[PDB]
Ligand binder design. Sequence first.
Ligand SMILES: Nc1ncnc2c1ncn2[C@@H]1O[C@H](COP(=O)(O)OP(=O)(O)O)[C@@H](O)[C@H]1O
Ligand SMILES: [Mg+2]
Lengths: 512, 170
Amino acid sequence: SFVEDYLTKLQERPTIIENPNILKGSKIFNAIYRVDDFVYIHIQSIKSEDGYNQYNVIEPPRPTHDEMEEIEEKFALSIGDKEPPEDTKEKEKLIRSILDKILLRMRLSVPKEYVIYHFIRDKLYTGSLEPLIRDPYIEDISIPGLGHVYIVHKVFGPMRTSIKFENYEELDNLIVSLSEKSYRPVSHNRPVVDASLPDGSRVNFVYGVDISRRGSNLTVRKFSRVPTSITQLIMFGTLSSMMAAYIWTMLDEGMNLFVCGETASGKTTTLNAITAFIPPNLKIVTIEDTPELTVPHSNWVAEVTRETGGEGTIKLFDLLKAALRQRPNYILVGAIRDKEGNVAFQAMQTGHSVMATFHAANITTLIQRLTGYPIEVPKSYINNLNIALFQTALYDKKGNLIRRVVEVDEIIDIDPVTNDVVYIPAFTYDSVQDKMLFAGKGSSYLIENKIAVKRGIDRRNIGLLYDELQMRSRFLNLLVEKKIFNYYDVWDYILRARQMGLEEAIKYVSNI
Amino acid sequence: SFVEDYLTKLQERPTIIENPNILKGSKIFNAIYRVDDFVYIHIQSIKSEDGYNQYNVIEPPRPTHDEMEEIEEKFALSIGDKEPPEDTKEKEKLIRSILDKILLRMRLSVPKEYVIYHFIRDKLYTGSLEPLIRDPYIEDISIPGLGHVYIVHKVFGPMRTSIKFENYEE
Ligand SMILES: Nc1ncnc2c1ncn2[C@@H]1O[C@H](COP(=O)(O)OP(=O)(O)O)[C@@H](O)[C@H]1O
Ligand SMILES: [Mg+2]
């Protein structure tokens, strides 16, 4: 076996372990754990001089270079005109079959199963990075330029791996090839690309020695295909159950809402979580530069922009215009920054609800940016946007990083004397006690001028609305208590609440 | 009676109603109305958690792939790299004439009227979508991606149809 082989070259043998969690804290060890049937990891407790532990990937041996060239060329010669299917499984099925035909009649330097591993690894997956992708104990992967691949391991922290890139052009080719597999090719014109690998891991590419002077570089950040849910956000303290119940009520009624803040404040995460509040039987069109939103609704159009360096380039603006003809109930724009913002408000003015993330720390800044170049939403249409929430990163007393929705504003008007926004802060934040404050009872213009009127409830039975709100807050609190945190489970519980009512829903989930 | 054929696989018995207006707005229902001679619609409420009720298309049975393929081949032959005229109604007329000419002495697994329906439906109209286009109670039709065709119905609101697209290429 390829593994046992490797061991025999060693000065002294490492102990086989199920996983590195046992090695935690320790520092006198020597171990090999299994990842795939094709990937074993050898971890060495002896630091390098620069304090890196060594992460050694054990893979089966590769065929010769000339063998590989012969195979690729034959593979290319077969089928070479036909395009492969889009479906990843059907694609791999086809490739393995074709490969099996070519190899059958060949005399290989290494076993067939090994040629197959490496061919598939390089052609369909992430090549020499694939073992790192497959190890669940890897958090982050970095190729900073020529040299080793560095990782952050959940047990050992930063480690130097046995994988090396010693050639500029080979490194360029890796970045080009991986970005193409991530559906968003780099180019010299647009050498910086954020995207996701097929497994869902986030990847950042920086292409070309003219920008990344030690060679093209990349960073992979692993993390769930399952998006963070609204119950997790409540448990984190990012928003209260009442705040979530409020948003839930508003999305039930088609309100337009922007999630605002600075970069990495968590805006996209919050937008994705609250999307689960959009009623299930509605049409959702998402428009993004790269996919991040994981919408659970069935009627979901997911559109992504494209840069070609010429004809065929499609921007958020173009997609948003097309959405006016796609009968969506909600349009979710990944981020609004340029003239697509103007079209977002056109969408609102034509009866489509909209959510987006936006870069602004407060309502004053949000309105200045919406109404100014290059967005130029006219002032009298600004109140089509109903709600702006503002989210920020902070440190607590201990120094731990936290993210908090620090204000939720209802947009009422722009005052003609003179050009200041009229708004109501429905929620605010006390940074000292780390608590969310509600305005609250009989403070919301949206509850008591839009929803109450639709309902159509009188100003003296308005308690009925605030009671439904307090109700939704209890149900959410209950989900948190019972540790219903998974995105799709939370979605199911929300749909369940739609389909038997709150009163019946709270009382159910109280049992477990 | 391709409708009766469809009906009999059904455990429950859809009421025939000829007009779905009389169901607005009932949360329980299992009925059938006619759209035209070749299209009946079976609508049904279920306990779906995402709030989509069922809109099932009832069309005549298709001829086999081999039957259809033979027909398309002969049709191509009968044209002989001649471009259609430029009118459109005179087109369908010419196409239906050629069809009769070709099906005249063929033996098909399904009635010849059904062969013509499907053939004309895929060649001239919108294929599997055509019943939805023909149904006057449908406002929106969406194929958002792989999965079901979704519609918005004047009586029932958004519904999930029985029509499915599960292959990227097609
Ligand atoms: N409420 C939260 N609590 C903790 N971490 C969060 C929260 N929201 C987002 N994150 C994490 O913070 C980082 C930035 O999140 P993201 O939603 O992309 O922010 P933005 O969209 O503002 O750039 C990501 O790693 C994400 O997993
Ligand atoms: Mg974001």
